[PDB]
Amino acid sequence: ELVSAEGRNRKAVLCQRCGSRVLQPGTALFSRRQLFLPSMRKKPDGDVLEEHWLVNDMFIFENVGFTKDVGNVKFLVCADCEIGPIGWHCLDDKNSFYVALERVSHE
């Protein structure tokens, strides 16, 4: 109901806390890569997730925030309410941004 025949997101991706629109439908690819994401918290413990929306560029995002670059890694957070991490990003791989399905909502 969420992944298309082409493997894209059939529905819009949004923040589960405030409803902020993170991604428009059909702009990301489903990915089963294992990534550890600290438990959801305010911007300033976790889970190894294996279901993500793979985004090619941060410009593709509708609304999204990034944490202070630490260890070549930046966590994605809701741009509006700032709760996260809803995603993950390794700076070495400029064109790979991941948004964990469990950490977001869909409409």
Residue 45, burial from CB neighbour count under 10 angstroms (0-12, 13-18, 19+): exposed
**Position 74: which residue type?**
K
Question: Is residue 47 a contact residue for Zn ion (CB under 5 A)?
Answer: no
Instruction: Find out whether 15 is annotated in a ligand binding site.
Output: yes
Question: Is residue 40 a contact residue for Zn ion (CB under 5 A)?
Answer: no
CA gap 73, 4 in Å, rounded: 29
Question: Is residue 81 a contact residue for Zn ion (CB under 5 A)?
Answer: yes
Question: Is residue 15 a contact residue for Zn ion (CB under 5 A)?
Answer: yes
CB of 20 to Zn ion, least distance (A): 4
CB of 77 to Zn ion, least distance (A): 8
